[PDB]
Amino acid sequence: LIIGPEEDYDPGNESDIIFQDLEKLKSHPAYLVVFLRYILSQADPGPLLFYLCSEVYQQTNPKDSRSLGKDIWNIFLEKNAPLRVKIPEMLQAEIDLRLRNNEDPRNVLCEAQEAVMLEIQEQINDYRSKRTLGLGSLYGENDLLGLDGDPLRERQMAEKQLAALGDILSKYEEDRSAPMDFAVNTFMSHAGI
Amino acid sequence: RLVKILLLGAGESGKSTFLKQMRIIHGQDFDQRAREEFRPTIYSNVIKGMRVLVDAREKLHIPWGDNKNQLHGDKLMAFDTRAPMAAQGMVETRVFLQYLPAIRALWEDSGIQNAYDRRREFQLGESVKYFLDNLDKLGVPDYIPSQQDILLARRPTKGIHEYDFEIKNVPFKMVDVGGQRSERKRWFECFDSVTSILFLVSSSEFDQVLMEDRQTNRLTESLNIFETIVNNRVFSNVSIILFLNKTDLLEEKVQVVSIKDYFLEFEGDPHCLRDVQKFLVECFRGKRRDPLYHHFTTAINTENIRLVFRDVKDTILHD
Numbered sequence: 344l345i346i347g348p349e350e351d352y353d354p355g356n357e358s359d360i361i362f363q364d365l366e367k368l369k370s371h372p373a374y375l376v377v378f379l380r381y382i383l384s385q386a387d388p389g390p391l392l393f394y395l396c397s398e399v400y401q402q403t404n405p406k407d408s409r410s411l412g413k414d415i416w417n418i419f420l421e422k423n424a425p426l427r428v429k430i431p432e433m434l435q436a437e438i439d440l441r442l443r444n445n446e447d448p449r450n451v452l453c454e455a456q457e458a459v460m461l462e463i464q465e466q467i468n469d470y471r472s473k474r475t476l477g478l479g480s481l482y483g484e485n486d487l488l489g490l491d492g493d494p495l496r497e498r499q500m501a502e503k504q505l506a507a508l509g510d511i512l513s514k515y516e517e518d519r520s521a522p523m524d525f526a527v528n529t530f531m532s533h534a535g536i
Numbered sequence: 537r538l539v540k541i542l543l544l545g546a547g548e549s550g551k552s553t554f555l556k557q558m559r560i561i562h563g564q565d566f567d568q569r570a571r572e573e574f575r576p577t578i579y580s581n582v583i584k585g586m587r588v589l590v591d592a593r594e595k596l597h598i599p600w601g602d603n604k605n606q607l608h609g610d611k612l613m614a615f616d617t618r619a620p621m622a623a624q625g626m627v628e629t630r631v632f633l634q635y636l637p638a639i640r641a642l643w644e645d646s647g648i649q650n651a652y653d654r655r656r657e658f659q660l661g662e663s664v665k666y667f668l669d670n671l672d673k674l675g676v677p678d679y680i681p682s683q684q685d686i687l688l689a690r691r692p693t694k695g696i697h698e699y700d701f702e703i704k705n706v707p708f709k710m711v712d713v714g715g716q717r718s719e720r721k722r723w724f725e726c727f728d729s730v731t732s733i734l735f736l737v738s739s740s741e742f743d744q745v746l747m748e749d750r751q752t753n754r755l756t757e758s759l760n761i762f763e764t765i766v767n768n769r770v771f772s773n774v775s776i777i778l779f780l781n782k783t784d785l786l787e788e789k790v791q792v793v794s795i796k797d798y799f800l801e802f803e804g805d806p807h808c809l810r811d812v813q814k815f816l817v818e819c820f821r822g823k824r825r826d827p828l829y830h831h832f833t834t835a836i837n838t839e840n841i842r843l844v845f846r847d848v849k850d851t852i853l854h855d
């Protein structure tokens with residue numbers, strides 16, 4: 344072993360499990376907002392925002408989502424897309440066709456979401472290390488300190504947290520912050536926030 | 537209107553030492569009474585420091601330079617570092633004098649010295665050596681720590697601390713914080729109205745591991761912390777200045793340890809200070825993803841900090 348010259352050091356829970364999995368991170372809006380603050384501040388927002396919007400489209404009726412499918416396309420997949428995400432060329436093309444015939448894109452779209460998962464997981468992993476460095480509070484983790492596992496309890500905190508994202512969303516250009524805001528709220532609202 | 541400066545960096549990078557320099561160079565300095573308050577800390581640094589050494593000699597199975605020093609080793613290990621005063625890093629003068637003979641004997645022992653040279657295998661600040669090589673002046677009954685002694689004294693920082701001062705009518709507010717992982721949660725409470733960040737890095741920690749988890753290389757930790765700070769869009773408006781501190785220790789170290797043994801990328805003369813410094817600068821510059829100012833410092837040297845801070849001030853005021 345070997346003793347230390349400073350024995351009064353205290354390292355200072357299971358929020359760890361929630362941050363490592365996207366499925367449950369999506370079910371815990373308060374935690375999702377923390378991660379979004381991370382992404383928006385340190386990384387490429389496209390992948391996650393695209394994934395989240397594509398999620399909403401999946402859980403919506405084929406007759407009530409054409410406009411959302413157009414927004415998703417123009418914001419993330421289109422050539423001049425402000426938040427362009429990179430997905431396999433075959434995938435890009437097939438989603439392009441389906442929409443140009445008003446078919447059911449959800450299937451290839453789901454494949455596009457899966458392809459973006461790789462980068463998202465890397466970002467999820469990058470954030471876990473920020474947590475290990477003890478820099479969690481840098482992205483709002485302090486707003487989680489005092490959260491019992493209650494669905495309604497958390498949704499309230501999702502607001503206020505989300506109501507304060509404009510702070511980061513401002514450091515962006517109007518042409519990038521606008522679509523981001525669209526995407527962010529598109530998923531949050533579908534999460535009852 | 538106020539120039540607010542935040543001091544960040546992993547544990548033991550030299551933040552508080554920089555803080556003290558600001559007080560010596562631009563503030564009221566440290567009068568004798570103020571310096572006397574460091575005596576307890578200094579005596580504690582030495583007793584606890586020597587205790588780590590004998591514990592290290594033993595566990596690393598390093599031979600005694602002389603077996604008779606075993607009894608002195610026993611006296612020191614029996615010192616309760618968990619008692620009240622010792623717990624808060626303090627030791628009375630009368631108690632310090634009781635351990636002096638034994639400490640002086642142990643410091644002369646080659647096993648103890650060998651253990652010191654292998655300090656990267658455990659946790660120990662290099663200033664304990666400075667005080668052990670000055671046992672003579674610490675032992676006199678009327679001892680008053682010098683300004684230099686004060687800068688070398690080790691006082692772990694917990695929480696946030698502010699120090700205001702002025703330089704030619706410009707008001708300065710410098711914020712100091714702890715750097716261990718557990719203390720970084722308090723870094724977010726000060727980022728408000730911050731004009732500039734001074735990021736300190738111990739340029740000689742490349743062969744050491746963290747106190748937090750005796751496994752992660754220290755320079756790696758510094759690099760990662762820096763990477764999250766410099767790439768955070770929230771800080772695009774803030775002036776980040778990098779301080780590769782402990783230049784004096786790096787200079788000595790490159791003569792006996794090679795950075796190549798810890799960081800493959802290094803291709804140059806590992807015995808060359810200039811090449812190691814260039815390599816380190818490269819490592820930090822390379823972390824920015826998108827004007828990165830840097831200085832090689834020795835926080836314990838007042839003249840060095842005086843000229844370095846002049847450059848910092850000019851940079852910040854013009855940005």
Ligand SMILES: Nc1nc2c(ncn2[C@@H]2O[C@H](COP(=O)(O)OP(=O)(O)O)[C@@H](O)[C@H]2O)c(=O)[nH]1
Nearest residue numbers: 548549550551552553663687688690782834835
């Ligand atoms: N030789 C040397 N010692 C230093 C330097 N900077 C700080 N120290 C010593 O390093 C130890 C830790 O520094 P401190 O300023 O307390 O670290 P902090 O934890 O970042 O606040 C102290 O004993 C300081 O005297 C330097 O540039 N050279």
Ligand code: ALF
Nearest residue numbers: 547548692693715
């Ligand atoms: F090691 Al510290 F403040 F970071 F005492």
Ligand SMILES: [Mg+2]
Nearest residue numbers: 551552692693
């Ligand atoms: Mg400190």
